[model samples]
Target: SDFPSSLTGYLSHAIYSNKTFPAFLVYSTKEKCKQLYDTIGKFRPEFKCLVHYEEGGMLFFLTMTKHRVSAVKNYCSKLCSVSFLMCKAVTKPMECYQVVTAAPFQLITENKPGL
Candidate 1:
């Protein structure tokens, strides 16, 4: 999906990190994207927010510290009810394990996912 040029400003603040952190792929409406962007800025100021334009909706990649994972889960739960997946690094290079769940907007154990 193509992102809007207007959001290019955010790319200026983007960081490239090898260290894995708790991240979320949030599917949202355009309005919700704005809301989430603002909410994250206010509540989780250290997070990285990336926006992608999809078919009739927006996808947000929110990356934050592991310590604040619960805060994000709680916020998502009370809002649109989206679930998160876990990513784990394995012995093999570039390979990782993933733990997925259908539970609504909750954080998975850190020991499980590769991210």
Candidate 2:
């Protein structure tokens, strides 16, 4: 099943970046969240991704269909984490999504890590 346009708009708008100081908080000190959000945003209407800032790391949520989720995960293995709900949604087939929590400031890089 696919999500209606109205539902997609609501979810996309509801997802936002953290407004706290050091905006990276929402994306994470590591920058992977930021990278992921930015990459996903490229296809905004179809796939909406956002980062919520927290104490240690950032919470990332993506609103997309099962097919979209699979494509994203397959394309971006380093940054893709399957959402618990999305996994269940596969069988249920609703306007579900995937959520992934990333560690604070952790980036998959070959060079020294730091902004």
Candidate 3:
């Protein structure tokens, strides 16, 4: 592989422009997830229903247009905390998510020139 810093250092550089960061909207729990899915179904299917063990509930992750981001969040109103036990998680964004999860479950396997 190439040097780590070569990639690590480029995070900021990578988004000197409007490369919108990836974000997840957690409509926590199966019930809430359904509400969100139904509500947003009319618009798009850029969402994946996921589950986290700590809360033992659903964590639907997805992204949408930058402008529609807040409009989406405004609909998912509440305390907006998906706590990892005592450690709480407010909704946020990231460059991207590194993911491998599994049980009533799934994981994606793509190796090669997958990117």
Candidate 4:
């Protein structure tokens, strides 16, 4: 349960640095994901993430050990003016992901999960 209680960290610090998980749900534009992966994936240290389900425009990843949730969230916000709701560092990505698949939200990505 590393989720932020009330925007706890400075984007430079992780409230859960004592523990961390890459488990996240990013409900964002496909363009954003690609740009993020291209840039972050390339530069990020020991980063390993993937697009989930081939359904929602969701991205999931986990760092090896360092650069916990806050850094990733902070980075995204700066790039997209992230609304936080736009992505999540929640523990239950699969549970939350059901929103797109079950909700009336139709596929927007040519790569809806996987085009």
Model 3 agreement with the true structure over 1-115: per-residue lDDT tens digits: 1112322321223212333333443424445554454555433445554444333343444444432334444445533334221111113323222331433334332112112
Between 1 and 2, whose TM-score is larger?
1
Q: Model 3 has how many clashing residue pairs?
A: 0
How well does each candidate superpose onto the true structure, as a TM-score?
Answer: 0.36, 0.29, 0.39, 0.45
Error of 2 at 25 (Å): 18
Runs off by more than 4 Å, candidate 1: 1-21, 42-47, 55-64, 67-71, 77-115
Model 3 scores worst on lDDT over the 10 consecutive residues at: 84-93
lDDT by candidate, in order shown: 0.36, 0.30, 0.36, 0.45
The most accurate candidate by TM-score is 4
Candidates' RMSD to native: 14.7, 14.1, 9.8, 8.2
Tens-digit per-residue lDDT, 56-77, candidate 2? 2232332432233334334334
Q: What TM-score, to 2 decimals, does candidate 3 have?
A: 0.39
Candidate 4, residues 1-115: lDDT per residue as tens digits? 2222332231223354554554544546555665565555533434223342333344544344444466566677677674332544555444443443443544332223421
Residue-level lDDT of model 1, residues 7-37, one tens digit each, is 3333222234343434444445555654555
TM-score of candidate 2 on Cα atoms, chains taken together: 0.29
> How well does model 1 score by local distance difference test?
0.36
